[PDB]
Design a protein around this motif. Sequence first.
Motif, short mmCIF file in Angstrom:
data_model
loop_
_atom_site.label_atom_id
_atom_site.label_comp_id
_atom_site.label_asym_id
_atom_site.label_seq_id
_atom_site.Cartn_x
_atom_site.Cartn_y
_atom_site.Cartn_z
N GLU A 113 24.74 -32.14 -5.44
CA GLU A 113 23.44 -32.10 -6.11
C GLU A 113 22.55 -31.00 -5.55
O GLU A 113 21.68 -30.49 -6.26
N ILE A 114 22.75 -30.63 -4.28
CA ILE A 114 21.99 -29.52 -3.72
C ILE A 114 22.38 -28.22 -4.39
O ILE A 114 21.53 -27.36 -4.67
N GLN A 115 23.67 -28.05 -4.70
CA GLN A 115 24.11 -26.88 -5.45
C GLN A 115 23.54 -26.89 -6.87
O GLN A 115 23.34 -25.83 -7.46
N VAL A 116 23.29 -28.08 -7.43
CA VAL A 116 22.58 -28.16 -8.69
C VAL A 116 21.18 -27.58 -8.55
O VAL A 116 20.73 -26.80 -9.40
N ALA A 117 20.49 -27.93 -7.46
CA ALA A 117 19.16 -27.36 -7.23
C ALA A 117 19.22 -25.85 -7.05
O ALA A 117 18.39 -25.12 -7.60
N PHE A 118 20.20 -25.36 -6.29
CA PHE A 118 20.36 -23.92 -6.13
C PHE A 118 20.56 -23.25 -7.49
O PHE A 118 19.96 -22.21 -7.77
N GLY A 119 21.40 -23.84 -8.34
CA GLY A 119 21.61 -23.28 -9.67
C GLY A 119 20.34 -23.29 -10.50
O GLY A 119 20.05 -22.33 -11.21
#
Lengths: 162, 162, 162, 162, 162, 162, 172, 172, 172, 172, 172, 172
Positions: free
Chosen positions: E23-29
Motif C-alpha cells: 500500500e505504500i507503493q500505492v501512495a508512491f504511485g
Amino acid sequence: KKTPLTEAISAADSQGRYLSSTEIQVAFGRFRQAPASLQAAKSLSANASRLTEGAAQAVYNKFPYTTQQQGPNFAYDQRGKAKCVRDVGYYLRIITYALVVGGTGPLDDYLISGLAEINKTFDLSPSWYIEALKYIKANHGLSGDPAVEANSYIDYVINTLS
Amino acid sequence: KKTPLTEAISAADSQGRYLSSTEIQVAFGRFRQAPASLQAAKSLSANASRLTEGAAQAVYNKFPYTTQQQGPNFAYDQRGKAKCVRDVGYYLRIITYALVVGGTGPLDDYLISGLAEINKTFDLSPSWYIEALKYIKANHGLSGDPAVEANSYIDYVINTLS
Amino acid sequence: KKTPLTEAISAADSQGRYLSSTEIQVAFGRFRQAPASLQAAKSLSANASRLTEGAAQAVYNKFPYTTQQQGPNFAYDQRGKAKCVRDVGYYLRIITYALVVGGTGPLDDYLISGLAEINKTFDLSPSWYIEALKYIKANHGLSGDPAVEANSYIDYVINTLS
Amino acid sequence: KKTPLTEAISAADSQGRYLSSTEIQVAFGRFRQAPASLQAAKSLSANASRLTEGAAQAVYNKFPYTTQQQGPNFAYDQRGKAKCVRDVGYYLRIITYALVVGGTGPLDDYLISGLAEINKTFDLSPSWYIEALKYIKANHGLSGDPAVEANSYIDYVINTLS
Amino acid sequence: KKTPLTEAISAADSQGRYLSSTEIQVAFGRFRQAPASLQAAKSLSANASRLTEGAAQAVYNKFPYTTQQQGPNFAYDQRGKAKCVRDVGYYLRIITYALVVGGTGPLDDYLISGLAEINKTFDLSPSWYIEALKYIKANHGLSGDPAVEANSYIDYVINTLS
Amino acid sequence: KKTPLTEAISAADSQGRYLSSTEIQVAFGRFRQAPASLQAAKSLSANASRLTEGAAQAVYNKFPYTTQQQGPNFAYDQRGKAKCVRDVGYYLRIITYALVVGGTGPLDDYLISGLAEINKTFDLSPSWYIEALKYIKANHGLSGDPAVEANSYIDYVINTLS
Amino acid sequence: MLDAFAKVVAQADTRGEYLTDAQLDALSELVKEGNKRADAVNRITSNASAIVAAAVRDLWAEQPQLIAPGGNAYTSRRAAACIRDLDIILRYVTYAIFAGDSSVLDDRALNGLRETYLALGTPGASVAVGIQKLKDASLKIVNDPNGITRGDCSALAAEIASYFDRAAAAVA
Amino acid sequence: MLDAFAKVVAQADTRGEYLTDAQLDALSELVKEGNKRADAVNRITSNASAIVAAAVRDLWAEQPQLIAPGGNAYTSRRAAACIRDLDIILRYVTYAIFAGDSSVLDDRALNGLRETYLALGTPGASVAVGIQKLKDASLKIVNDPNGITRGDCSALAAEIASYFDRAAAAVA
Amino acid sequence: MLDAFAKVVAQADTRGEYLTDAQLDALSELVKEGNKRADAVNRITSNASAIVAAAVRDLWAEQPQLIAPGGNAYTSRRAAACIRDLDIILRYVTYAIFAGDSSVLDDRALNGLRETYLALGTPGASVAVGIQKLKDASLKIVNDPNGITRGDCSALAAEIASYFDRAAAAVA
Amino acid sequence: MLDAFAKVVAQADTRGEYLTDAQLDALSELVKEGNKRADAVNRITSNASAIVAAAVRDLWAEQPQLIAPGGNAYTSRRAAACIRDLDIILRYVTYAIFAGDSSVLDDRALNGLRETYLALGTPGASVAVGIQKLKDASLKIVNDPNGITRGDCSALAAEIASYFDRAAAAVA
Amino acid sequence: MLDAFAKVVAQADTRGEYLTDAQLDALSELVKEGNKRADAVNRITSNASAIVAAAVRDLWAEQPQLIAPGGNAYTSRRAAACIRDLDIILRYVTYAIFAGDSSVLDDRALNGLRETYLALGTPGASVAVGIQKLKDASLKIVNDPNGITRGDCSALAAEIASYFDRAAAAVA
Amino acid sequence: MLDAFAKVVAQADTRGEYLTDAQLDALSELVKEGNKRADAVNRITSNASAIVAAAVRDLWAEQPQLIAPGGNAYTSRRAAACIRDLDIILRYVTYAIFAGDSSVLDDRALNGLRETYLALGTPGASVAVGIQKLKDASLKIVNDPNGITRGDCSALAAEIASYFDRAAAAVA
Ligand SMILES: CCC1=C(C)/C(=C/C2=NC(=C\c3[nH]c(/C=C4\NC(=O)[C@H](C)[C@H]4CC)c(C)c3CCC(=O)O)/C(CCC(=O)O)=C2C)NC1=O
Ligand code: NA
C-alpha cells in the motif's frame, strides 16, 4: 459456564425439548463423580500456596534463563517473580473451579480463551506453564478418582499450550 | 441416534473438541444405569405378548367403538385387530430399544418422527395409544430404577400424543 | 388475509412491480363470482343455528360415546354440548368468511393455523369435526356456484383434518 | 411465461399448497377475458405489416435524423431500415403474445429483460420505440375490452422504456 | 470516495491488516502521478467556461433537433439550454474531481451512480453527453500524462453511457 | 499472491470493475519501487549463507540454553543446529521473495499462515526467530530504499511473531 | 394484507358475528363498481412513468434547493433515489385502490417512512409535496372522459385521493 | 412454468411468427372448456387427502414388504415420507391440469425423481403403482356425475390420465 | 447458562478466591440430594402435557373473555400460542430445577417477556395466573408419595416454587 | 472513505465549485511531503506490536484494578480484547496518517465507540489513557532521527498527534 | 491471484532456491517496459464498450442464426447476456495484461466456462469467434501509433494475443 | 451417530425383533468394562498434542520428501494442515472408543477422505503411516500400567487398534 448440567440443558434447549432420562443420567454421573471433585478441590485450595510457589520455582529450575534474562516478560526481578507466582496461581485456582463444577467451562472462559494472544503479546512461553502444570500434577498428592479428574484438567490446559 | 454417549460426542464434535471429563461423567452415570435398564428390557421382551395383547384389549375396553365402527382405521374386524396389536407391539418394542440405549433416540427415529402425520392420515386417534401406553405402565411389573426409566419413556410417547 | 385481491398484490409486490392486466383479470373473476358467494354467506348465516345444532347432533349419532364418556373433551354434559355446538359454529362462521372474501385466508388465519395443536392438547378428535362438516355439506341446501365454492371450503377444512 | 395460470401455480407451489377456489377464480377471470384478449391478438396480427411499417415510419417522421445521420445505429440506409422495421415487428409480435397468455410474461422474458442494455450498447434511443408504440396504439383500430387490454401492454412497454 | 489511498485502506481493513509496503507503493504511485493529475485539473478548471459552452454547442450541431423539437428534455428554449450547459458543467467538474483524487470515486458517487435511471426518466440521450465528452477530449488542449489521465476519465464516463 | 498488482486486480474484480487510472498508478509506484526491491533481493541472496549462519548464532548467544537443553526442539546437537539454520534460511529466502513481488504475499502464504501452530506444536519459541530477524536487519548492509523495504518485511514477520 | 372484503370479515370475527345483510349488500355494491376500480388501477399504472417524472420535475422546479449542489436530491444517485421513492409510493397507492383498503399502503410502505426520512436528512415535507403532485396527475388521468364508458366516478376518486393524502401525512 | 397458452406462444417465438388463426382457435377452444378444467382441479384437490390415503393403503396391502420391518416404508418417518411423495405428485398433477401443460410436473417434480429413488433405495416401480392408484381414484372423482352439470369430459379425462401415466413412467 | 456450581464459581472468580471449605460442603450437600432433584425433573416432565392442558383449561374457565371472540386466546393460532407459552415456561422451569439455578429461566425465557406481551396485547397478568396453575399442579406431582422412596422434599419443593413465582412475577 | 484530496473534493461538490488554484497548490504540497507520510506509516506499523504491548503494560501498571480479579481487563479473554482495542485503534490511526484525513478513523473506529464502551462496562477514560500511550510511543518512533533522511516532520508529527487525541477524546 | 513476479517466486519456492541473477534481471526488464503495459491496459479499458459492441455486431453479422428468432442470442435477455459474456472476458483479459500472467483469467473466468456453455446450449465456437473479435479490435487499439510515445510493443502485443487466445480456446 | 447399544438396536429394528438375552448380556459386558474405556478416552485425550506432535515428527523424519521444498507438507500452512489432519483423525478415533462404535469416525472423518487426498495430491500412504504412529503412541499410553488400578485391557486395546487401522485403510 460449560458443566455437565449446563451442556445437558443447552443441548435440550437447542433441540427445543424437555430433559429426558438421557440428561438425567448426565446428572447421575455428575453427582456421582462430584464428591471426588469437591474432594480434590478442597485439597488443592489448602495446598495452593505451596503448590503455586513450588510450581513457579520448578519452572525457574528447568528454564533458569527466565530468572536471568533482562526484560518485562522475565522473572529476573521481584516484580517478574510476583507476576509468575500470580499467573501460576490463576492456573491452579481456575483448575479448581473446573473440578468444582465438573467441566472445563471455567478453564475455557477465564483462562484459555485469549490465552495464546496473551502469551504471544507478552513473550510468555507456553513451555514455562507446561512445566508448572507438570509440577502441580506431580506434587498435589491427590489419589483415586480426585487425582484422575484433577490431572485431566491439568492435561487439558497442557494440551492447549502445545 | 440420541443416546447419552452419542449426545456427548455430538456436543464435543460440534464444538470441535476432544471429549473431556464432563463427557466421561456422562458415560459414568450411563454405565451405572445400564445394567439394570438392560435386564429391564429382557423383562419387557419376555412379556411383550402379554403386555401387547393386554394393552390392545384395554384400548378396546375404554373405547369399545373402535371394535365396532365400520372403517379401515378401526378394529371392527380381524384385519383391524391385527393392525392394532401390531402397532402396540411397535410402541413397546421401540420403547425397549430406548431402555437399551438409555435415550429417546430409537423412539424419535423409529416411532415419533412422522407419527402425527401417520395418525392423521389413517384416522388413528392418539387417545387409543395413550390408553395402551397407560396399560403397559400399569402392568409391566418392573420395579426400582428400571421401572422409572421405562415409565419416563412411556410418558415420553404419551407426551408427544397429547 | 389471503384473498384473490391480496394474493395478486402480494405476488406483484414480491416482484417489486405494478399490477398489470393479469391481476385485473383476477379482480374480474373475483367480482364475477362474488355475488353468488355473498348470497351463499347470507343463506349460511340465516341457517347457522339449524346447521350447527344438526351438525353436532350428527356427530353424536355416529359417535355415541361423545355424549356418554365422562371427560372434559366430551359432550356428555350440557357444558360439553355447548362447547361442541360452539366449535361447529366457529367452523361454519369462518367458512362463510371465506365465501365473503373468495379465499381460504379466514380459514387459514382464524381456524386452521394451530388447529392440529388444539385437537391434540384437548383430546378432540378430527373425525368429530370431519363428520360435522359432512353434515353441513349435505344440508346447507345451497345450489350452483355458491354450493361448489362453499363445498370447496368445507372440503378444504376436511383435507386439513386428515 | 408469467400468465394468470402460472402465477397462481407458482404462488400455490411456493407455499406448498394445493390450488384453492382463490386460484380457480383467477382461471375464471382469465377465461372470461380471453375472447377479448385473443380478438385483439387476431386483429393486431392481421394488420402486423401495416402497423409495423407505419410505426417505423412514424419514428422517421418524429426523429428525421434517424434517416439522415450515417451510423450503424441509424436507418439512413436500407440496412438500418430493415433492422428498424424488424425491431418494431418484434415489439408488436411479443405484444400479441402477451394478449394470448393474458400476461406480461412474453414481454418480460422475450423483450424487456435486458432491453436497456441492448439500446445503450447499440445506441438505440428508447424514445424511438416509445414513438412507434404510440403510433400502434393510435392506429390498431381495436375498441372495447380488446383495445383497453392491448393498450395496457403497449403502455407496459412504454413504461419500461421511460 | 474511491482513490488509490482509500482503496488501499479499504483492502487492508477488509482483511484486518495494517498497511504494508504494497500500500505504500500505492501512495508512491499516487504521488508520482499527482502533479500531472493536478496539472490537468487546474487547466480544465481555468478553461471550464469555454469547454462547457463549447461542448454543449457541439451537441447542438451534432443533434440539431435538440434545439428544435419542443419538449421538457430538449434545449429548444433558454430553459433547456441552461439545463444542458449545467449538465455538461457537471460532467466536466466531476471529471476534474477524479483527477484531483486520482480515481473514479467522485465520478462513480457524484455522477455515474443512478445516471442510467436519470437519463431514461427525463428522456435524455446518452448520445448527447458522449458527443459533449468527445468535444472536451478533443479541445482541452492537455498534453503528456495529464492528457492521458484526463482522457481515461472522459472515456470512463463515455463507457458508462454506452 | 498478495502483490500490488494482484491486490489492484482483486479489488477491481470484487467490484465487477475494469481497471482504472487508480490501478495504473499502483503499477506505477510499483514499477518505481521494483529496481530497489530487486537490488535488496540480489544482495540478500549472495549474502544468504553468512546471514543465515550468523542469525542462528545470534540466537545461540542470546539464549544459550537452545544449544544445551536436550530435546528435539533445541539446537543442542548437529541435527538441531541444522534444523535451526534451515529455518532461518526459510525466513530469509521468503523475505527476498516478498521484495521481488513487492508485497507480503509470499510471507503470508509460504511462512506466516500456520506458523503459530507450528511453533506451539514443536515448542519453538517466537523469541528465537525474532532475535534472528533482528540479526539479519542489522547485518544485511542494505542502504537506501532497498534497506527500508527489506526491514519492513522483516518487521512484518516480527509483528506476526509478537 | 387486507382488502375491503377481508377488512369487514376481520372486524366481524373480533365480534364473533356473521356479516349482516346490510354489510353484504354494501360489499356487493363495491363489486358492482368493480370495473371503475379496474380502470383507475390500469390508468394510473399505464401512466406511472410520466406521472412520477412530472411529479419530481414540478417538485424540483418548485424547490430548486433539493437538486442544487449540496441538496438532498443532488447527484444522480440521490436524484434516482428521489424518483424511486415517488414511484414506490405511487405503486403502493395503486395496490390500495385495487384492494379497496389502505392496509397494504400503511403496513408495507408508510410505516416508519417518517422516521426513515428523519434518519436520512431527507425533507419529508418535500416528499409530501411530491406526493400531492402524484395525486393531482393521477386523478386527472383517472377522471379522463375520453376512451372510456362515461359515468360517475366521484366516489372512487374521493377514495383514491384519501390514499395519497394518507401517504403525504405519513412521510413527515 | 408454462401453461397451454405460454407453450404455444413460446413455440411461435422460435419461428418469429404471429399465432395463426388455427392456433388462436385451438386455444380459444381450451378457454371454452375451462369450467370442466376447473371442476377437475377442484374435485381432485377437494378429495386429495382421501385419494392419497387410499393409494398408500392399497399399495401397502398389495406389497406388504414395503411396511414390514426393514421395508422402505417401515417406521413412522418413512411411512409419512411415502404418503408425502404421493401427495406431492398428486398436487403437481393438479397444477398441470390447471395449466393444461405438464411442464410444471416435469420441471419441479419429475425431473431427477427417477435418480433420487435410485439413490435412496426406494422401489420406483412400487411408486408407479401408487401413482396408478392416485390416477384411478382421481378419474373416478372427476367423472362423478353427481352434483355437476352433466357434460362430456372424456378429453379432459384422457389429458388427466396422461399426466399420471407420465409421472408413473418417470419413476419406474 | 449457569448451574448452582458455576454460580458459586463465577462469584469466586470476581473475588479471585478459592471456594471455602463451607462452600464446598454446601455444594456437596446439594449433590447428595441429586436423586430428589432428578425426580422433580422427571415427574414434571413426564406430566407436562397434562400440567399445561389443565393450566390453560382452568385459566380459560376462570377468565372466559380470553377465549371469547376478540380475546387474546381466541382463534386456533392464538389458542395454540397460549398453550405453547405455558409449556415453554414449564420447560425452562424444569431446566432451572435440573441446574439448581434460575439463570437459564431468567436469561432465555423471562428476560423482556413482559415487554413482549405488552407489545402483543397479551394480558401478562393472565399469564401469571396460568403460571401459578402450572406451579400448583407441578408441586402436587412432585410431592406425590406413591411409587417413590419416601422422604423429605420440602426444601426442594420450596426451590421449585421459587422458580414459578419468579416466572409469574416477571409477567404479572 | 476520504483521503485529503477527496475531502476537499467533497466540500467543493456541495458548493458546486471547481477547486481553487490555492486549494490545488495545498494538495500539491501534501504530495511533495508524501515520503515523510509514508515513513510515519511504515515506522508505526513496523513497531505496532511493541507499541500496543507497551500501551497496555503501562496502562495496567498505572491502573492495576483493571487486571485485578473482577476488573474489566481480567481473565485471558478480556485482557486479549483490551489488547485488540488498542491494536485496532492504532491500526485505524495509521490509516488516517496514510490518507491525510481522519474520516476512516471517525467512520469506522470511533463512530459509536464511546457508547459501545458504555454498554460494555469498559472505562472509556482508561481506553483514552491507552490511546495517549500509543501516541507517545508512536511519535518517538516517527521522530527517530536514525536510519532516515533528516528533515522537518513537525507538521506531520502534529497531524499524527491530532489523530490520537481525536480518538482519545472520542472514547472519554 | 498471480502476477509475473509471484509466478517466478512460486516456482523458486517449490525448488527452495533464491531467484538467480538472470531471473531478477528478466523481471527487471519487465518493469522497464511497464509504461507500454499500462498503455495496453488503459487503451483497451478506455474503449471497452466499442470493442464489445463491434465484436458482437460483426459476430452476429457473420452468424445470423445467433440472433434470428429462436437464436441463442435472440431476445433481449440473451442478447444482453451475450454482450455481457464478451465484456466479462475482455475485463479478465485486461486483468491478465496488468498482472503479466494468465492466472486471474484462468482461475476466475475460464475455469468451468466450456462446461457452462454446454449445459446451456450456447455455441462455444461462436463465443470463440466473439473473443477473437475482441482480440482483433483490442490489438488494433493497442498498436495505434497516434497520441502515444512511438516505440516497440510487439512483445507485449504478442502477450496480449495469447490471453485472448487462451480464452477462445477454453470455450471451443 | 451410533454407540454400541444403538447399532444393535438399529439392526434389531430392521428385523422387527426384541434383543435376545445374548444380545442384552453382551451389551452388559461392555457396560461392565466401561471404566477401562473411560480411561482409554482420558489417557489418549490427555496426551493428544504430544501424540500428534510425535506422529508428524516421526513421519517427516522417515519421509523427508514431505517437508523438503516442494513437498506436500512443505510451507508452514501445509505443515500445519498436516498436523491438523492427524489431530482430527485422533479426535474422531477417541469418539469411536467412547461410543464403542466406528460410525462417527466413518461418517464424519473417513467418508470421502481418500478422494479428498487424491484431489489435493496428498500421499494417502503417507497419511496412513502417520495414523499408524498415532496408534502405536496411543496404545502404549493406554497400556501404561502406572497410576491406575491394574487389570486386563487387551480386548479394549484390540478394539482401539482397529479404529486406527480402519482410518489408515481409508486413506491408503
Ligand atoms: C494514468 C494514465 C497514464 C498512462 C496509462 C501512462 C502510460 C505511459 N506511456 C509512456 C510512454 C511510452 N509509451 C509507449 C507505448 C506505446 N508506443 C507505441 O508506439 C505503441 C502503440 C504503444 C505500445 C503499448 C512506449 C513504447 C513508450 C516509450 C518507452 C516507455 O516509456 O515505455 C509513459 C512514459 C512517459 C511518456 O513517454 O509518455 C507513461 C507514463 N501515463 C499516464 O499518465
Ligand atoms: Na382423537
